[PDB]
């Protein structure tokens, strides 16, 4: 076992799991889900004594809410069995335990509803509504909604009740930023886009509205059920180990077409 030395002792035997997922979405103008997947990693940070037999249990459905892995690679320390149990003697400190992909039953934490109105050929009226879709006790953090503007843009007027927004002319986008937002809510932004005149013939190819966010759950639906520690020499049971998990779900590509 060349990934863990043999001397290791801690009074405080503790581990931390980070489930880190990036959720990706392409949505049609009329709310259809054109494409969506999650990529995830589980990172373990183990401060455990001796050489212990860890067993990682999740809400895998092949084994309540239960979920569907398309595929995954593991860290060499993992004993490949097909009971679908995850067994290993972990390296010390921090390492990547598994990497995975999911396409089915994904929680899309945000819904984006765009509305666009042409006003002659002098301006565009734009309304965008975002809906948080997740437990109300949970807050999303670091929410950005990026609304692209045409190249013939004289100037931009925006109102929003939540957040701050700026027209960023060099980037050709309005950028709305919200610090915090809770589950099962709505917010909207209105903007009026002043146009320059332009070659009437070439039309605007409206790129998507994209979002960034971070959420404290796994959009795949993954929940950690247990992490079991057995060290058969040393005199500490499983229930002596202090165990922690956190979830950090972040947008990848998360685009809604208008």
């Amino acid at each position: 076992i060349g990934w863990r030395r043999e001397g290791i002792k801690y009074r405080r035997n503790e581990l931390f799991l980070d489930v880190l997922e990036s959720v990706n979405l392409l949505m049609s103008p009329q709310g259809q889900v054109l494409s969506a997947h999650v990529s995830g990693r589980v990172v373990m940070k183990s401060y455990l004594s001796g050489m212990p037999e860890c067993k990682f249990g999740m809400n895998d459905k092949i084994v309540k809410q239960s979920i569907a892995i398309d595929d995954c690679t593991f860290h060499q320390c993992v004993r490949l069995s097909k009971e679908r149990s995850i067994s290993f003697i972990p390296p010390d400190g921090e390492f990547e335990l598994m990497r995975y992909r999911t396409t089915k039953d994904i929680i899309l934490p945000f819904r984006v509803i765009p509305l666009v109105r042409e006003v002659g050929r002098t301006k565009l009226e734009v309304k965008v509504v975002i809906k948080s879709n997740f437990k109300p006790s949970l807050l999303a953090q670091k929410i950005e909604v990026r609304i692209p503007t045409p190249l013939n843009t004289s100037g931009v007027q925006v109102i929003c009740m939540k957040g701050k927004a700026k027209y960023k002319a060099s980037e050709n986008a309005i950028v709305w930023k919200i610090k915090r937002m809770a589950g099962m809510k709505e917010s909207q932004i209105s903007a009026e886009i002043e146009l320059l005149p332009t070659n009437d013939k070439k039309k605007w190819a409206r790129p998507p509205i994209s979002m960034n966010f971070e959420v404290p759950f796994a959009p795949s639906g993954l929940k950690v059920r247990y992490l079991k520690v057995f060290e058969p020499k040393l005199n500490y049971s499983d229930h002596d180990v202090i165990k922690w998990v956190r979830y950090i779900g972040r947008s990848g590509i998360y685009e809604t077409r208008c």
Partner: peptide, 6 residues
């Protein structure tokens, strides 16, 4: 943000 595994 870290919670106990129950």
């Amino acid at each position: 943000q870290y919670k106990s595994i129950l």
